[PDB]
């Protein structure tokens, strides 16, 4: 009906007008008075050399020492990063995995991919082996991200345009978030784990309430598919890296884009983004085989992590902020300090 | 400088390393084929010869083949096609009888053009199956090729029409040097399609070995 189309157009115009009214000064104008962090020199302290294919995801344990990594050789490897020892190696039923999660308690890990199933594996069993605790099915597209809320609750994003909050005890979708129009590629949980942001292929990100399930706000501005999303440590902002070779920082309360991190040299898209412990550094993995450490406040390239011979696919920062792990499309993970 | 527990942990890590190495060696001896088509093209029959992604394992002359039919994956192909960067070959199935309408033949043509001229599948070879040759013959005897191809100069002969379609598909290749296209005419036929696949992947493996040595 034309009346619905006109109402939607006027509502979008009102949203744009309200956002413009709430904007008075760009974050760069306010921030430029502060001292730049200078050149950020980081060296490869450790190199994890166990995988045999492209590494697609990695996640840090909450103890900032154990990390789980997934590659398309059908293996989930739990590494002790301090000693480069392999704590665990789990054979996956489906070798096509694009996501990987570590439970905050450290008892479980999660995996998923082109098989449209989120597999939860129990790491702490009396039998002494890692076994599949539960397979969650109900997504009609590939699983792109999964994040543990606790030992019993997980939230998954899929290429079937929808997100789902599950219940591992029963394996049923407790909540379904359906607001996107393209494949959802990333997922970031808020520090309080009551909200989460999802970035999809319609060049938009959406903020969902976990408790009941609603798209509270929608953030646009990207020119292509958003591949990565990460919450600011404060929890009042987030950053999205997309295929148009740019990262963007949005603010929840302002409901607006705060900053754009881009450079004319960079023409390749971003595969992963993460923040430092204080939020001053925004780390972004690129397809040009390098990672860029941006000054999240001043939008300047504070440093470059150039140690990978292929596209950097996954990137994470420890909970204590001591190190950053990057996994790329070669079979190597690197720890930087 | 390592305590007893640290030494035992290192030993366990080395055992895990050995198991991973053995698993990777076993996996590297497997031919990975990416199966593609336009739905009713006839992928089901080809799979018969030998929710998300579907895997088919078979064996031929002591060679282990893994065929990955991503055919009920109705998402953005660009977001997951790079996962198959590195397969031995792409088996593309097209129905010769699907040139009637509902355009289908052109749909297969555009899908083949998109797959062949891809950044990831720059060096991967494509085994092209043109199946349902009997229904193609039956349709040709009654209706001409001109509905699908207005700029076609030929009679209602099976051989000439089939050859014209084959070259029409083979001209979609842009990188006609680094990638080779193998064409077979199929039809719910004798086991000759598995032999054709084996021959094509043998050629691809010879080329890959020559690349590895470095002469190429």
């Amino acid at each position: 009906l034309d009346q619905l189309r006109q109402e939607a157009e006027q509502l979008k115009n009102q949203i744009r007008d309200a956002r413009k009214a709430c904007a008075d000064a760009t974050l760069s104008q306010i921030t430029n008075n502060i001292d730049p962090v200078g050149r950020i020199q980081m060296r490869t302290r450790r190199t994890l050399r166990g995988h045999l294919a492209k590494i697609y995801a990695m996640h840090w344990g909450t103890d900032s020492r154990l990390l789980v990594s997934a590659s398309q050789d059908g293996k989930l490897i739990i590494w002790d990063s301090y000693t480069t020892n392999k704590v665990h190696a789990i054979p996956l039923r489906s070798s096509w995995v694009m996501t990987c999660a570590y439970a905050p308690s450290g008892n479980y890990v999660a995996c998923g991919g082109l098989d449209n199933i989120c597999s939860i594996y129990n790491l702490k069993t009396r039998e002494g082996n890692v076994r599949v605790s539960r397979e969650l099915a109900g997504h009609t597209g590939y699983l792109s991200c999964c994040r543990f809320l606790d030992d019993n609750q997980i939230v998954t994003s899929s290429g079937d345009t929808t997100c789902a909050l599950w219940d591992i005890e029963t394996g049923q979708q407790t909540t379904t978030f359906t607001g996107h129009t393209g494949d959802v590629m990333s997922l970031s949980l808020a520090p309080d784990t009551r909200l989460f942001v999802s970035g999809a292929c319609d060049a938009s990100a959406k903020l969902w309430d976990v408790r009941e399930g609603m798209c509270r706000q929608t953030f646009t501005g990207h020119e292509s598919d958003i591949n990565a999303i990460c919450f600011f440590p404060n929890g009042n902002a987030f950053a999205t890296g997309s295929d148009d070779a740019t990262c963007r920082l949005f603010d929840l309360r302002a409901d607006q884009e705060l900053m754009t991190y881009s450079h004319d040299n960079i023409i390749c898209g971003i595969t992963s983004v993460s923040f430092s412990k204080s939020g001053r550094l925004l780390l972004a993995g690129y397809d040009d085989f390098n990672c860029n450490v941006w000054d999240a406040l001043k939008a300047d390239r504070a440093g470059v992590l150039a140690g990978h011979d292929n596209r950097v696919s996954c990137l994470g920062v420890t909970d204590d902020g001591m190190a950053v792990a990057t996994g790329s499309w070669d079979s190597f993970l690197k720890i930087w300090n | 400088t390592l305590s007893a527990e640290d030494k035992a942990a290192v030993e366990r890590s080395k055992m895990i390393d050995r198991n991973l190495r053995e698993d990777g060696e076993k996996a590297a001896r497997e031919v990975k084929l990416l199966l593609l088509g336009a739905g009713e093209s006839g992928k089901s029959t080809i799979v018969k010869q030998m929710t998300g992604i579907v895997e088919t394992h078979f064996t031929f002359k002591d060679l282990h083949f893994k065929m990955f039919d991503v055919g009920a994956q109705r998402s953005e192909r660009k977001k997951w096609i790079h996962c198959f960067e590195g397969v031995t070959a792409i088996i593309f199935c097209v129905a010769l009888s699907d040139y009637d309408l509902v355009n289908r033949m052109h749909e297969s043509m555009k899908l083949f053009d998109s797959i062949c001229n891809n950044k990831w599948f720059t060096d991967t070879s494509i085994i092209l199956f043109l199946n349902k040759k009997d229904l193609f013959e039956e349709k040709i005897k009654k209706s001409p090729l001109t509905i699908c191809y207005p700029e076609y100069a030929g009679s209602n002969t099976y051989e000439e029409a089939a050859a014209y379609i084959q070259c029409q598909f083979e001209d979609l290749n842009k990188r006609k040097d680094t990638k080779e296209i193998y064409t077979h005419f199929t039809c719910s036929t004798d086991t000759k399609n598995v032999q054709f696949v084996f021959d094509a992947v043998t050629d691809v493996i010879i080329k890959n070995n020559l690349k590895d040595c470095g002469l190429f």
């Epitope: 039998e127 082996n129 | 305590s3 942990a9």
Partner: single-chain antibody
């Protein structure tokens, strides 16, 4: 059901060549390093031998080196201890402890039932001082254990283990690495201390908590135990 069953004990003449077997059922036996730990009748536990996962590493006590041999049959899920030139000092009950080693693991977590064996007729010293203290339900008791060498390693781990042996039962792991409470142990047990001085505290002691408490070091082989403190009343 992570049970370990022991067989091959009995009466052996001196100089005999009796062999003990240990059947494992309910866990991935191939991934566990396995120990033989003996206990003389009126004595405490004493570590005998250890075989790693994959049989790549083997250790023996100085009292059994050259006469004992430990081995595994992983497909059969069995652990063997072949003992030759048996002497009267080898009269003991033998246990078949399992221990897996990775970051955060809890070694020595499960013990077998033990096989009795009766023969006819640089090491770290761990001192447990007190040998018997009477207790009453509801109270809190602190069991002390001193070490000759500092068990605190350069990596931050203090390799001290606390085991409890109830009357007429097999020892069970209470604490591993001096602070971590083993799975299934009630929270009333706690472990603290520093290098060469450790203490296991039982707060609000009750029934089924009486027995002999042993402190063991895993800093280096051979592993050594304390004499044990008995809890009665």
């Amino acid at each position: 059901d992570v049970q370990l069953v022991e067989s091959g004990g009995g009466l052996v003449q001196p100089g005999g060549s009796r062999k003990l077997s240990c059947s494992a059922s309910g866990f991935a036996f191939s991934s566990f390093g396995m120990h033989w730990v003996r206990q003389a009748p009126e004595k405490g536990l004493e570590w005998v031998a250890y075989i790693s996962s994959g049989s790549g590493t083997i250790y023996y006590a100085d009292t059994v080196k050259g006469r004992f041999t430990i081995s595994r049959d992983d497909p059969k899920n069995t652990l063997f201890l072949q003992m030759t030139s048996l002497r009267s000092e080898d009269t003991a009950m033998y246990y078949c402890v399992r221990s897996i080693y990775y970051y955060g693991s809890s070694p020595f977590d499960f013990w077998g039932q033990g096989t009795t064996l009766t023969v006819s007729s640089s090491d770290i010293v761990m001192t447990q001082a007190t040998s018997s203290v009477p207790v009453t339900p509801g109270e809190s008791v602190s069991i002390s254990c001193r070490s000759s060498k500092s068990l605190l390693h350069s990596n931050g781990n203090t390799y001290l283990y606390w085991f409890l042996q109830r009357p007429g039962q097999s020892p069970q792991l209470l604490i591993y690495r001096m602070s971590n409470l083993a799975s299934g142990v009630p929270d009333r047990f706690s472990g603290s201390g520093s290098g060469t001085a450790f203490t296991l505290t039982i707060s609000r002691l009750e029934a089924e908590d009486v027995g002999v408490y042993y402190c063991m070091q895993h800093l280096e082989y051979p592993l050594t135990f304390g004499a044990g403190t008995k809890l009665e009343l």
